[PDB]
Amino acid sequence: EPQRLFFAIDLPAEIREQIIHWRAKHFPPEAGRPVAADNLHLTLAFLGEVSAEKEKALSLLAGRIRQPGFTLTLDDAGQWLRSRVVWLGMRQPPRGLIQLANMLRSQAARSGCFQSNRPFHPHITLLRDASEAVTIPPPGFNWSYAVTEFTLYASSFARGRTRYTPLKRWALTQ
Ligand SMILES: Nc1ncnc2c1ncn2[C@@H]1O[C@H](CO)[C@@H](OP(=O)(O)O)[C@H]1O
């Protein structure tokens, strides 16, 4: 059956907990719709609706990826008014993050995946449906962790929440 899929990098439990606390402190409920703590992630490549045959092809392509791990330090926060999101990010993302995304984006495009032809802006979405031009505080201190793997996720909606289901993970070769 066709599953809406995407590749993502996840955050350690402690940092996610620090983020939702920082968010609740600086952003009122009317600033946007809050992303659940377990849904905090950094999307590497969106694939759109993809079937089992093509999912299997894309997984194989992901398995041939050979790339060392890298460190993410979240020193940047902002707001995209047109896309209507409040985001967390990195001013100077490591080349590894850029390399990994580009490797995965070019693999989906050569498999026949829906294309946006938009630049890759590594970010972690905190608020959705943000309309008003609120004010963005700097992120918390020392939101920095080592990236050890990336995951292929399935997107679904179950009883009033958005749910991401992990399917497969690939480690980065250190
Ligand atoms: N049709 C589409 N085209 C481009 N990007 C899309 C999309 N549908 C969803 N997205 C985006 O891919 C991520 C899915 O976890 C989300 O990004 P973020 O979670 O905000 O980083 C969607 O906004």
Side-chain angles (χ1 to χ4, degrees):
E1 288 296 320
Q3 294 191 303
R4 185 170 301 275
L5 307 185
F6 65 95
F7 290 105
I9 287 182
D10 284 296
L11 289 69
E14 184 195 73
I15 297 187
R16 301 199 305 265
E17 197 179 12
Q18 295 192 19
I19 290 172
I20 63 173
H21 286 87
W22 172 87
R23 185 184 59 192
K25 194 152 101 78
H26 296 92
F27 299 96
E30 303 83 12
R33 181 179 185 277
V35 176
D38 302 271
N39 290 342
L40 295 175
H41 66 269
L42 198 157
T43 298
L44 293 170
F46 184 76
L47 307 178
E49 220 78 22
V50 27
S51 60
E53 285 201 306
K54 189 179 178 186
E55 168 179 347
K56 192 175 303 298
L58 291 172
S59 291
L60 215 63
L61 283 166
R64 294 186 67 84
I65 293 178
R66 302 295 178 266
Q67 179 176 144
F70 49 86
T71 300
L72 286 186
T73 303
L74 304 177
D75 62 349
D76 202 19
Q79 179 176 38
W80 291 335
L81 293 177
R82 297 191 59 175
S83 310
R84 285 163 58 160
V85 296
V86 176
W87 54 262
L88 209 56
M90 196 162 179
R91 293 175 188 272
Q92 301 294 322
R95 299 184 115 268
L97 180 57
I98 299 302
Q99 283 187 47
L100 181 59
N102 289 337
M103 186 73 170
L104 285 164
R105 294 164 61 102
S106 67
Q107 284 174 0
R110 289 187 294 98
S111 295
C113 287
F114 167 64
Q115 190 71 13
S116 73
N117 273 310
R118 279 204 170 180
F120 175 62
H121 306 275
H123 70 276
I124 306 159
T125 298
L126 310 175
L127 288 183
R128 303 203 182 270
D129 300 321
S131 304
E132 62 173 332
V134 291
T135 62
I136 307 301
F141 164 67
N142 228 23
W143 292 356
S144 179
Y145 67 100
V147 178
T148 61
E149 57 191 16
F150 66 94
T151 306
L152 175 69
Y153 278 102
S155 181
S156 72
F157 188 94
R159 199 183 168 272
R161 290 197 299 169
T162 303
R163 292 177 58 253
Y164 301 126
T165 304
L167 304 178
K168 293 172 188 41
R169 308 188 194 268
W170 299 268
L172 301 177
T173 69
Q174 286 292 326

